[PDB]
Structure formats: structure tokens, C-alpha cells
Amino acid sequence: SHMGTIEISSPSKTHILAFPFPEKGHINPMLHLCNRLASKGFRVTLITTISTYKDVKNKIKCGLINLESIPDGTDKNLGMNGYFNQFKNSVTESVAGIIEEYKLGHDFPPPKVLIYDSTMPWMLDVAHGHGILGASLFTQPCCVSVVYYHMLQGTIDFHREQSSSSKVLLLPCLPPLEDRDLPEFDYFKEDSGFVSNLLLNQFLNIDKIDYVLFNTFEMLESEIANWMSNKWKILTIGPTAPTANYLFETNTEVCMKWLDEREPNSVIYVSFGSIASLTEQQMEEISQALFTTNFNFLWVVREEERTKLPNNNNPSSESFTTAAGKLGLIINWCPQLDVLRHESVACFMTHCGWNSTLEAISSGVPMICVPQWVDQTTNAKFIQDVWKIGVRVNNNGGGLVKKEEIERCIKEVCESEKGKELKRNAMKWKDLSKEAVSEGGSSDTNLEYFASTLLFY
Ligand SMILES: O=c1ccn([C@@H]2O[C@H](COP(=O)(O)OP(=O)(O)O)[C@@H](O)[C@H]2O)c(=O)[nH]1
């Protein structure tokens, strides 16, 4: 006869903590990843600052994710330094308290891993200091991330005096990068060094991270992902957003109704993300282009940005018939993924934030690139010249993008034979995007590696 005990380690008895930096471009890929992990059966606790808790609570539906709030640690009114140092002190202690709370509880399994935003690398020390694994979630592509790595290593001169000559930078497994293709820190002026260090320091403890996760897929970034694979065991697990236990954004019904009433491939979707704020002159140039183009438009203009519009109680939305006989809608926020996947959307005029770029890739929507800072410039270079799914506008070579140049790009993407090829390329990358996260695809495999190895004794 036999006698003894069997212990089973399963996703249902495995507790994943996740902690995004409180900006939408960081929260959203983290949330999507939490949804996929919950679907595999894991217990998942999303930790987020109290000021983003409401936004996140309104978005998550059907249940599977356990939500915890922590203090903001900031007030958003101070300058970047201080807003950040207080921030790091505050969330270290509060996440540490959550970790210990769940180690001692009985409703949940003890935490086995903390998934933390890659720009908060000190959270690896919190995870290890409490005896649990640390997964660093990068929310930018491999290609721009490697540029930060090379910048941190201080081997090549990244200083730019662009006024006396033009520089082109060659890094391994990357295309030649002109000066305008480098991640853009000069916009931030005296805080350029601080923003820079934030992104560079993602790599301070790369050798010690238990899981390095990238919201990208291998085929999209083949050469550079492999390069990174040979140095670190990175796991490309993207897109974390679902293909065509979910996220519900506001104004979903409004935008879907409006788009349903347009013709297929008739709408330019315009958004500059959750953070960027364009000058009122830049808003003017974009306005006049969209009001004279041969297409309908849906333009997200955030509430705080309505004052920058050309034009006492800023409307939450505004409906238009344009000078070319088309229809426009300005709205404070939309379900961007549903919008990009709508048959009416012909192209995406974007600031080229990474989530916007990859959502567009996963939706097969070609792009007009109007990058503003950090990784957006590098993303635009890859969108136009590598993936060939969009066109980048030309600034005085920070410079204003004039309506005529915006119109140029709209006509190329939306009217020309070249535009038809960009669309074909975008549908191709969308299929590869789907294959990566389907069973046996590179991202499904890499995410299963993370999930399966979490169970090991
Ligand atoms: O009307 C909008 C505009 C943006 N987004 C989402 O907000 C995120 C923007 O992140 P991104 O990386 O593109 O740029 P960031 O906002 O960080 O500059 C993306 O997940 C978008 O889908 C949205 O849900 N509704």
C-alpha cells in the first residue's frame, strides 16, 4: 500500500501582485496583462494609487482582479523631482505593507511575484526584500529600450549639438538612427536629465530581475529582441491587449454610435494620448487640416486641453460639419482600441506613444506620426521606415507641424496608392500580432513560461 501527501501548485493557488506607474500608458498594458493572467486562473491583485483607483475600478469588469489602493505619494503640482522622490518613498512603504498583509492573510495565497513597472526598478528590492519574485514590465518597445541601455552604458556620445552638423547613430541590431529618431528628452528643458535618468535606470538592476517582460511581439522586433535575448532572458509577451475579464473605457457608446453611422474607411481617428499637451498654435494647425480634409474625423482632446483649442464651460464633446462636407467629433476620451478596430477608421493620427502604436498594429490601422517626446520619436521612425505602416510629419527640422504638412500626410496615407500599401502592411502586421498571442505563438509561449515557472518548487 501507499501512504502520503500530494501538494498541488496551481494558478488558482498562486497570487500575482501587479503595480503600474500611475499613468494610463503604464496602467493599461498592466491591466491587460492582469486580465490574461487571471484568465489562466491566477489570483491577481492590482495595486494602484488612489487617484487612479477610480479610473481603474470603472474599467475592470467581470470580478477576476482584486483591486488595492495606495496613497498617491505626490500631489501632481510639484516639479518632476520631489514629485518623484516622495513618490518612491511612499509607494515602497505602502506596497511593502500590501505584500506583508497578503503573506499573513488566508483569503488569498501569499504573494509569489510582484509585477512592477520597469521605470520603478527599486521595486525589485521591495519584492526581494520581502522574499518574493520581481517581474519588470517594460511598457516601451525593445528598440527604444535598447537605446536607453546604450545611453546608460555611456559608451557612445549621445550629446547632440544638432546646429553644426547632423549625426547618425549605429547601434547593433538597430537601423541607423538620425538625430530626430533618438528618444526626445530636450522638450523637458531643465528636467531633461531627470526624465532621461528615469528611462535609463530601467536597466540598473536588469541582471537581477526575475522576469523581464516586454509588451511587444518577437516578429515585430525580431533582430533587437534576439539581441536582448542573448544578454538577458527577456520575455516578449505582447500585445497584452486582447485581439478582436476586459477593459471598458468611457464614451464607448457615444463613439461606437457615431462611427457606426459613418462609411467604412472614412474616418481619421486623432489622439495624442493621455499626457501630451500641444501648443495652441499646434492645435490650430491640426484643426485647420482636419476641417479641410476629405475625411470624417474623431479627435480626442482631453478636458484640460480644450482651452488650447482655437474655438466659459468647455464642452465635453462637440460635433462638426467640416469645410469639405464631412463630419467631425471632438470628445474628451474614447475606447481607443474599439475605435481603432472600427470598420469606419481609415487611419490613426497619433503621438506614437507605444500603446497607441501597438494597438494600431494589432488593429491594422495605418498611422500619421506626430511624435512629441521620449520614445515617440523612435516609435515614429520604426512606424514609417521599418514596419512601413505610417508616415512621419516634418516639423524647422519642437518645431511646429503646419497644416499643409499634416494635410500632405493625410492625403498620402488616406488617398494615395502609397496609403493603400501602408494599409496592406498594417494588415500584415496585425495578423502577425494575432499569431504571437495565439496558442503556440511567441508571446503566448513566453507568457506561459512566466506563468508555468511561477508554479515551480
Ligand atoms: O481617447 C483615448 C486615448 C487614449 N487611450 C488609451 O490611453 C493609452 C495611451 O498610452 P500611450 O502609450 O499611447 O501614450 P501616453 O498616453 O503614455 O503618452 C493607450 O492605452 C490608449 O488606448 C484611450 O483609452 N482613450
Ligand 1 center–CA 273 separation, angstroms: 4
Atom number of ligand 1 nearest to Cα 350: 13
Q: For residues 369 and 249, is the Cβ–Cβ distance under 8 A?
A: no
Strand 133-138 versus strand 60-61 pairing type: unpaired
CB 235, CB 450: distance < 8 Å: yes
Helix (H, G, I), strand (E, B), or coil: what is residue 340? helix
For residue 352, the ligand 1 atom closest to its alpha carbon is 13
**Letter for the amino acid at 435?**
E
Read off the DSSP letter of residue 37.
Answer: H
Biggest alpha carbon–alpha carbon distance for the chain: 87
DSSP 307: G
Give the integer Cα–Cα distance in Å for 254 and 335: 10
Q: From CA 409, how far away is CA 401, in angstroms rounded?
A: 11
| Cα distance between residue 247 and residue 28, in whole Å | 9
Ligand 1 site-directed mutation target among 118, 274, 298, most atoms within 8 Å of CB? 274
- Could you count the other beta carbons within 10 Å of the beta carbon of residue 351? 22
Backbone angles phi, psi at 187, to 5 degrees: -50, -35
Binding positions for UDP-alpha-D-glucose? 26, 28, 139, 274, 333-334, 336, 354-356, 359, 375-376
Which 3 state secondary structure label does DSSP give 321? strand
Using the mean position of ligand 1's atoms as its centre, give its distance from the Cα of residue 356 in Å: 6
What is d(CA 204, CA 217) in angstroms, rounded to the nearest whole number?
Answer: 24
Cell triple for 329: 467629433
> What is the 3-state secondary structure of 372-428?
CCECHHHHHHHHHHHCCCEEECCCCCCCCCCHHHHHHHHHHHHHCHHHHHHHHHHHH
**In this structure, are residues 28 and 333 in contact, taking their beta carbons and an 8 Å threshold?**
no
Nearest 5 degrees, angle CA 27-CA 31-CA 32? 125
- CB atoms < 10 A from the CB of 347, how many? 29
DSSP string computed for 196-262: HHHHHGGGTTGGG-SEEEESS-GGGGHHHHHHHHHHS-EEE----S----EE--TTHHHHHHHHHTS
In angstroms, rounded to a whole number, what is the distance separating the alpha carbons of residues 172 and 181? 16
Report residue 328: phi and psi, to 5°: -130, 155
- Measured CA to CA, the distance from residue 218 to residue 239 in angstroms comes to 10
Task: Report the alpha-carbon distance of residue 347 to residue 341 in Å, rounded.
Answer: 10
Write down the number of H helices and E strands in the chain.
15, 18
At 390, phi and psi to the nearest 5? Answer: -175, 180
**Which residue has a Cα nearest atom 10 of ligand 1?**
25
Residue 282, C-beta contacts closer than 8 angstroms, at least 6 positions apart: 400, 401
Q: 3-state DSSP call for residue 329? A: strand
Q: Which amino acid is at 329?
A: L
Cα 164 to middle of ligand 1, angstroms: 36
Q: Hey, what's the cell of 142?
A: 525593445
Distance 139 CA to ligand 1 centre (A): 12
Distance 275 CA to ligand 1 centre (A): 8
Residue pointed to by grid coordinates 476629405: 294
Ligand 1 midpoint to CA 215 (Å): 14
Atom of ligand 1 nearest to the CA of 276: 18
Cell readout for 298 is 474623431
DSSP 8-state symbol, 10: -
Q: Identify the burial level of 433 via C-beta atoms within 10 angstroms of its C-beta, where 0-12 means exposed, 13-18 middle and 19 or more buried.
A: buried
CATH topology of domain 11-244+435-455: Rossmann fold (3.40.50)
As a whole number of Å, the end-to-end CA separation of the chain is 27
Distance (Å, whole) CA 153 – CA 143: 16
Query: Residues forming the annotated binding site for UDP?
Result: 28, 249, 274, 334, 336, 351, 355-356, 359
CATH number of 246-434: 3.40.50.2000
**How buried is residue 173: exposed, middle or buried, by Cβ count under 10 Å (0-12/13-18/19+)?**
middle
- Note whether 202 and 121 are within 8 A (CB): yes
Query: Who's near 115: CB < 8 A, 6+ residues apart?
Result: 16, 17, 18, 19, 30, 33, 135, 137, 213
Q: For 80-146, give the secondary structure using H, E and C.
A: HHHHHHHHHHHHHHHHHHHHHHHHHCCCCCCEEEEEEECCCCCHHHHHHHCCCEEEEEECCCHHHHH
Q: Determine the Cα–Cα distance for residues 352 and 308; give it in Å rounded to an integer.
A: 21
Q: What is the rounded CA–CA span in Å between residue 184 and residue 160?
A: 11
Task: Give the Cα-Cα-Cα angle 131, 135, 140 (nearest 5 degrees).
Answer: 155
- The grid coordinates of residue 247 equal 477593459
The set of cell numbers assigned to 73 is 505619494
| Residue carrying the nine cell digits 467640416 | 322
Closest by alpha carbon to 236, among 220, 222, 217?
217
- Which method resolved this structure? X-ray
Cβ < 6 A, ligand 1 pocket: 23-25, 28, 249, 271, 273-276, 300, 333-334, 336-337, 353-356, 359
Q: How far is the CA of 196 from the centre of ligand 1 (A)?
A: 21
Calpha distance 222→347 (Å, rounded)? 25
- Helix, strand and coil content of the chain, in percent to the nearest 5, comes to 45, 20, 35
User: What DSSP letter does each residue of 157-207 carry, written as one string?
Assistant: -----TTT---EE--TTS--EEGGGS-B-GGGGGGHHHHHHHHHGGGTTGG
Rounded to whole angstroms, how far apart are CA atoms 147 and 288? 36
Annotated binding residues, written as ranges, equal: 26, 28, 139, 249, 274, 333-334, 336, 351, 354-356, 359, 375-376
Provide the residue type at 122 as one letter: W
Pairing of strands 267-271, 296-300: parallel
Give, for ligand 1, the residue of 23, 24, 373 to mutate: max count of ligand atoms closer than 8 Å to Cβ.
Answer: 24
Cα 91 to Cα 46, 66, 85, 97, distances in angstroms: 14, 18, 10, 9
Q: Which residues pair with 140 in a beta bridge?
A: none
Spatial contact of 418 and 388, defined as CB atoms under 8 Å apart: no
**H or E stretch covering 363:** helix 354-363
Q: How many residues does the chain have?
A: 457
435 CA to centre of ligand 1 in angstroms: 23
Q: In whole angstroms, give the CA distance from residue 176 to residue 381.
A: 10
Instruction: List the chain domain ranges.
Output: 11-244+435-455, 246-434
Residue 54 burial (CB count, 10 A): 11
